[PDB]
Design a protein around this ligand. Structure first.
Ligand SMILES: Nc1nc2c(ncn2[C@@H]2O[C@H](COP(=O)(O)OP(=O)(O)O[C@H]3O[C@H](CO)[C@@H](O)[C@H](O)[C@@H]3O)[C@@H](O)[C@H]2O)c(=O)[nH]1
Ligand SMILES: Nc1nc2c(ncn2[C@@H]2O[C@H](COP(=O)(O)OP(=O)(O)O[C@H]3O[C@H](CO)[C@@H](O)[C@H](O)[C@@H]3O)[C@@H](O)[C@H]2O)c(=O)[nH]1
Ligand SMILES: [Mg+2]
Ligand SMILES: [Mg+2]
Lengths: 360, 360
């Protein structure tokens, strides 16, 4: 029983945080998102997880080394001297997938959702064919590829990976189960699975469609990070009300790390996740924001729908709103108004930005 | 000796403040604008003052006779039916100035400066002509009437109401002394004094000029009101350093009324005048602003180059900048941003203003 994760890649959409660390390694509610996916695969029970590293590949490999001994599950990397796309890692790991005649999971690392994994392999055993997709309805189609879905069998009549304005509402949830019979069709050259093998596979009608229960979201865009974090905090309050912090100054659904410190006389708005090692001073209001690790936020400041990078210092009386992303080790001077600014790492801002723009 | 102050002008430039209370009654460094002038006229030793205001406002009619026994000098007013310009007040009040053969003072209500009234009056007694003006050098002469001064004879060759050709650098500063004789040049019919009667007086040579010493500023405009306040605070620091409030949480030239209450752990920036009865909470940073009376500013908020009207309640974590003006009885919700927003009285605001505009 082996599962595949397309880790790495460039991650060009989440850019001001992915300049410093790779996209699977960024902290989504005090844990990396790849860590969430491998907790799900370890909870389902998988001996071997194959993982492809096309990016930095030091500081992604050492964390997998460390996490193998905490999970107790054997992990493998495959990497490549050139980017094989998202299809080509199947052809690279074809032998280590081919020695066992088991169906294998295929996951995108940016996807966070409730994980239907072994209900999905029961679905795959029921219909009996080679390829199963996950499908979730999403309001805007053009973000993510769309499938045509029928009633009982769920056989996909027609596939298209880049949607038109009104072609369909059901979106590919980016989570697949592939048999060993499909890697004989894939080639060694760098291709992309979401467009090459799915169109030709949709010609035969071997693809079937598994629905999802709830809160499917990608974290690839920096806005999508925030709304997916809000959805995950809601569903975490559903499942584990224990874990969310309750306090008199805390309103809504707030997740605080133990090493994080909250100064008194301050309000924490809804849907806020505080990383490990942060310190929030007296009289700070922060709503719908994600603060990563070791970040200091000074007194009398207001932050709303923002992402604060690692080792960031926010001055006093700073107002940040509208998806202002701060890179790693960014120092913000006091009495500044940031609206919509994505700030590149190791930068300091002298003056306020009134409009959304990228600060180099 | 008599003195005529021109008030008029319900809607000249201080508009959200004048919607509630007439222009000479609003507070400028914890004193009304008229009260600065009539205190300087008491220091001049004038015997009777008369204000010509084209509207009968009942509250100021209470105020003047309430003031005149502390002042020691009787105060009268003169009301015209339709506004006769700025000369018609002198023509309508001709009898009170013509009954005694002494020079009389003419003032504008918006002009505030150090008033050199004994030096001015002697200067008029020494030169002995029909009218003496006070001029001052300003960087931009376009807004003001600009005189040409002869060297050491203070005689004015030319008086133009407006420039547009840069006749000179020195401007009329709103300070006239007029003889009884020039009473018969004016007519009861509506006209304007600085447009009409000064030019033909300067053609003869009866107009004379004296240059002020320091910090002339108009406070007609609200943007001009703030810089006039910041300039008066520095000159008042030179004159009365012990009147200006000093403290560890207080930075720069700050004038605090003893009834005002300032909370703990907050930094009052430079050039800030607080009204009587204001309440400043914890962590409020106020720079270059003027807070009128009974106005409460809640905690953790930042205000910079702003005017706060009477009986105002400002929410927490609010950021106000770019010369914003609140009218009377204005309540601002918490976590808002006001940039350039001029606000009408008795209006509550529940949205942030991104750009300068007027809110009704
Ligand atoms: N090793 C390797 N991995 C890669 C490469 N390119 C992409 N990957 C992995 O492939 C996954 C998807 O890549 P994206 O480029 O972020 O995909 P997308 O534009 O968001 O669209 C795809 O994902 C959506 C769901 O997240 C799908 O809905 C959509 O149809 C499509 O499959 C990511 O986790 C990334 O790590 C590569 O060149 N090399
Ligand atoms: N009674 C009455 N008084 C008036 C009227 N109009 C103006 N006043 C008063 O006359 C003074 C001048 O009015 P403004 O219209 O505001 O003049 P300005 O644009 O500021 O220019 C004048 O004053 C400048 C200094 O403040 C001068 O530099 C300039 O030469 C000019 O005289 C103010 O005190 C105003 O209250 C009126 O129609 N009737
Ligand atoms: Mg993606
Ligand atoms: Mg003016």
């Amino acid at each position: 029983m082996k599962a595949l994760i397309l880790v790495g890649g460039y991650g060009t959409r989440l850019r001001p945080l992915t300049l410093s660390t790779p996209k699977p390694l960024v902290d989504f509610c005090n844990k990396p998102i790849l860590l969430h996916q491998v907790e799900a695969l370890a909870a389902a029970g998988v001996d071997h997880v194959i993982l492809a590293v096309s990016y930095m590949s030091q500081v992604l490999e050492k964390e997998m080394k460390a996490q193998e001994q905490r999970l107790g599950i054997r992990i493998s990397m495959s990497h490549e001297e050139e980017p094989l796309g998202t299809a080509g890692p199947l052809a690279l790991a074809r032998d280590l997938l081919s020695e066992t005649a088991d169906p294998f999971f295929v996951l995108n690392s940016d996807v966070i959702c409730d994980f239907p994994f072994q209900a999905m392999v029961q679905f795959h055993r029921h219909h009996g064919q080679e390829g199963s997709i996950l499908v979730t309805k999403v309001e805007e189609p053009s973000k993510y590829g769309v499938v045509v879905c029928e009633a009982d069998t769920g056989r996909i009549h027609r596939f298209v990976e880049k949607p038109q304005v009104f072609v369909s509402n059901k979106i590919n949830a980016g989570m697949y189960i592939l048999s060993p019979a499909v890697l004989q069709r894939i080639q060694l050259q760098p291709t992309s699975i979401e467009k090459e093998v799915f169109p030709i596979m949709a010609k035969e009608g071997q693809l079937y469609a598994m629905e999802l229960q709830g809160f499917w979201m990608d974290i690839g865009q920096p806005k999508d990070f925030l709304t997916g974090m809000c959805l995950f905090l809601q569903s975490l309050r559903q499942k584990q009300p224990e874990r969310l912090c309750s306090g008199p100054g805390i309103v809504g659904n707030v997740l605080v790390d133990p090493s994080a410190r909250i100064g008194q006389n301050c309000s924490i708005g809804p849907n806020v996740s505080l990383g490990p090692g942060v310190v929030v001073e007296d009289g700070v209001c922060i709503r719908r924001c994600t603060v990563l690790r070791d970040a200091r936020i000074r007194s009398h400041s207001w932050l709303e729908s923002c992402i604060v990078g690692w080792r960031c210092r926010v001055g006093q009386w700073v107002r940040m709103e509208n998806v202002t992303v701060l890179g790693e080790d960014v120092i913000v001077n006091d009495e500044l108004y940031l609206n919509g600014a994505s700030v590149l790492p190791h930068k300091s801002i002298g003056e306020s930005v009134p409009e959304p723009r990228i600060i180099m």
